[PDB]
């Protein structure tokens, strides 16, 4: 258990998923606000969602303003939710395991 490597890898995966969540937000906003721009971003992003930081630098090359919109939102979500994640994952895992050890073991 290389714990700082695992944590480092885990944080980068959370950051990429939160970038995907922000992209979902910005996309739903532009759904009300700017339907064309929404259609561009939805087709631009399909399959690109792999690495969040690579996705951002690539979206900056095309449309610096929209990349900034996703940058703000990913960060807003993180500041609002990240503090609840520890307790959710720890008790989530303990509860999911507890179920299976009950039926099987």
């Amino acid at each position: 258990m290389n714990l700082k490597q695992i944590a480092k890898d885990t944080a980068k995966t959370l950051q990429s998923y939160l970038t995907y969540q922000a992209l979902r937000t910005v996309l739903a906003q532009l759904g009300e606000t700017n339907p064309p721009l929404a259609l561009w971003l939805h087709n631009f992003s399909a399959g690109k969602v792999q690495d969040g930081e690579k996705y951002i630098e690539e979206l900056f090359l095309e449309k610096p303003d929209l990349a900034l919109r996703i940058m703000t939102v990913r960060e807003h979500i993180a500041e609002e939710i990240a503090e609840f994640l520890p307790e959710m994952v720890v008790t989530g895992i303990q509860q999911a395991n507890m179920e299976k050890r009950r039926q099987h073991l």
Binding site: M1, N2, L3, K4
Partner: protein, 467 residues
């Protein structure tokens, strides 16, 4: 045969966890206390410790098959949870005799504690005990003289010996140093000593101190008719300087020198211990820096391992703690490693922290030295705990005697002689120590003044509950 080379990472426990192994009498055994990182099983963690302190690394190498790994590998043969503590275990690991350089504490430590304490997969690691096999113990010189030869050289029998560190620690000139020494020794102390950090400095160069201190020893010995000594500190920047200083002490006919074995190191210490044997100079060992290593019970090396290592490297005295003074010392633990440094055979006893039975094959014992924050009121407890074969040292407890140095010295000298007389008469120093001191205080005003000063919080509270 050589079982085929398959490259790649395997679990350590496949090779190094051997719960069915029975240790040989030539095996070096180690007891580690560890906490694995979350997700690392205890047996894999124990195996990793055994692997990376003997023969193994993180991935499979083909070179193993050029030799006989079974003969050479460290073997984690037992793991047990620490009772009452979450995620803490003892691992017992056996190391073949072949792994170690004869007569080298440096090499032994390099294997056992070289790399494994920093392993990511382990949160904390503390070496509790090592059983040194008799076949390895015999490759060491051990103490230059040891307890019985020292008493015989100094004509000191029948009670603890008394010492005293000169204060202030630093700042005194050579002449003022010898002055303080003369006045202490003339008053009844057997020894005085350099502070551990007194080496050679702008305010006091070493060769000047050696000169003036030798004069003080001669004058006080002539006046008292008892053998006097002062542990001249030869702790130095280099081996060459260390030896140069040891040499002058011998030239002056000085009976005893001191060395800080941990801050100087085991390689320099082992050199000095051999020289002391060849030159008939007693060696007092100061444990400066040990608490950096041995204080916390979750991580480090317990002092009793360091004490064992020092007896092997060589020292005639070694500080053991006081239990009751200004620095920390657990009583049960202390009684344990005092036995380890004095006796020839010490049975395993976990209640005193002795994990393994240790034999010494007639290697001389080391005198325990109780020093630090102790005064006259501690005397009966100290005599009780350590017995006759110990040195009790009073630095502030001598030089801090309300009327100054000479009365301070007399207070200590009277207190000592009163205790030695009482002991020899059959009085129990533990039970009667306070009384013996009060008695002597009756006719020694300067002892009475000291007893008053350092008596110390009393409690005393109250009766009401009347019918």
């Amino acid at each position: 045969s050589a079982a085929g080379y398959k490259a790649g990472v395997k679990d350590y426990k496949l090779t190094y966890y051997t719960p069915d192994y029975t240790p040989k009498d030539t095996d070096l055994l180690a007891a580690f206390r560890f906490s694995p990182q979350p997700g690392v099983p205890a047996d894999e963690a124990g195996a990793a410790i055994a692997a990376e302190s003997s023969t193994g690394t993180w991935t499979t190498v083909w070179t193993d098959l050029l030799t006989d790994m079974d003969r050479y590998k460290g073997k984690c043969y037992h793991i047990e949870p620490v009772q009452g503590e979450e995620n803490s275990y003892f691992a017992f690991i056996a190391y073949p005799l072949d792994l170690f350089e004869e007569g080298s504490v440096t090499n032994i430590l390099t294997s056992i504690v070289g790399n494994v304490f920093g392993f990511k997969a382990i949160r904390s690691l503390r070496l509790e005990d090592i059983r040194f096999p008799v076949a390895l113990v015999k490759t060491f010189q051990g103490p230059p003289h040891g307890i019985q030869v020292e008493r015989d050289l100094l004509n000191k029998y029948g009670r603890p010996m008394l010492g005293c560190t000169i204060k202030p620690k630093l700042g005194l000139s050579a002449k003022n140093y010898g002055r303080a020494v003369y006045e202490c020794l003339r008053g009844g102390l057997d020894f005085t000593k350099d502070d551990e950090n007194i080496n050679s400095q702008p305010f006091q160069r070493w060769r000047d101190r050696f000169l003036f201190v030798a004069d003080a020893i001669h004058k006080s010995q002539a006046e008292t008719g008892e053998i006097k000594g002062h542990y001249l500190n030869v702790t130095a920047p280099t081996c060459e300087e260390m030896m140069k200083r040891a040499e002058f002490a011998k030239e002056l006919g000085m009976p005893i020198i001191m060395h800080d074995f941990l801050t100087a190191g085991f390689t320099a210490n082992t050199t000095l211990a051999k020289w002391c044997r060849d030159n008939g100079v007693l060696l007092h060992i100061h444990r400066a820096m040990h608490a950096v290593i041995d204080r916390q019970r979750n991580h480090g090396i317990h002092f009793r391992v360091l004490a064992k290592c020092l007896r092997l490297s060589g020292g005639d005295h070694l500080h053991s703690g006081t239990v009751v003074g200004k620095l920390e010392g657990d009583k049960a633990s202390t009684l344990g490693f005092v036995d380890l440094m004095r006796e020839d055979h010490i049975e395993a006893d976990r209640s005193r922290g002795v994990f393994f039975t240790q034999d010494w094959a007639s290697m001389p014992g080391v005198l325990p030295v109780a020093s630090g924050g102790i005064h006259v009121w501690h005397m009966p407890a100290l005599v009780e705990i350590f017995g006759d074969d110990s040195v009790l040292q009073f630095g502030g407890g001598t030089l801090g005697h309300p009327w100054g140095n000479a009365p301070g010295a007399t207070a200590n000298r009277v207190a000592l002689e009163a205790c030695v007389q009482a002991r020899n008469e059959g009085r129990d120093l533990y039970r009667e120590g306070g009384d013996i001191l009060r008695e002597a205080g009756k006719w020694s005003p300067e002892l009475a003044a000291a007893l008053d000063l350092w008596k110390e919080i009393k409690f005393e509270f109250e009766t009401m509950d009347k019918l």
